[PDB]
């Protein structure tokens, strides 16, 4: 039984605390992405709108001709 608790608790507690912050860091980077992921969405929607705007713009010019 005992004797070997000396070599285990003072071993796989530190590496299992090397997880209890190497995860507590990720939870920033995840939402560091949703930060970016959302700006991206915002960016595309801006282009998408300019596109429709320019298509019409072209239809109007094309119409001015012929």
């Amino acid at each position, epitope marked *: 039984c005992c004797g070997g608790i000396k070599k285990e608790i003072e071993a796989i507690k530190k590496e299992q605390e090397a997880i209890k912050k190497k995860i507590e860091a990720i939870e920033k980077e995840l939402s560091g992405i949703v930060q970016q992921q959302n700006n991206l969405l915002r960016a595309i929607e801006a282009q*998408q*709108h*300019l596109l429709q*705007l320019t298509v*019409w713009g072209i239809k*109007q010019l094309q*119409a001015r001709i012929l």
Partner: antibody
Amino acid sequence: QLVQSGAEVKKPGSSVKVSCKASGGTFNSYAFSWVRQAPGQGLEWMGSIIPIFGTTNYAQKFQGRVTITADESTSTAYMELSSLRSEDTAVYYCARYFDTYNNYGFANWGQGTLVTVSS
Amino acid sequence: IELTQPPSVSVVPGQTARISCSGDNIPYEYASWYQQKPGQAPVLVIYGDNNRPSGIPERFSGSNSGNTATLTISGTQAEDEADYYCASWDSMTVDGVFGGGTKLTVLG
């Protein structure tokens, strides 16, 4: 959102500008049309402009008589009809489309401008 | 391109009301419906593929079928008594075009 110039009286054969100030929002993202209504009658579409290029297109009935322009500095659209005759007496509306990309509908309107062409 | 509505349409309080816009070189996502009460700017009620703008009541729906737009009010009201217009754009010319309007009557 959209507010227009006040009501007018014009001699026949003369002309008139009408203005429309689009408040709060990006003027380059807008598309605008003028739509007039004769008393107790239907709406009739006159022309459109896209401010960010200033490309306009007009309904044939009014082609020659009507000009539409915009001024980004002041966020304003203008329509100007010349060689006025009685049938032009109408309420003139200013309308914004492309509120969103898939929306070809006129989501916002002016309060209207009554124009009266009597001698 | 030109649009065609029934000049008026009357209905019993709390029924389905149907205005039809018709013709001719088709829309579809270009088509819009508007309600105008006396002495007021039109208010967009339906646009494209059966879409309500914000704060618009669900009794309003947009229908479509080839040549034809149909605005449809479920369980009408007295306040729904108004003049209605359909509008769309000619894909060639990009001209805007309105129907001649339809006086929805709930006269009693």
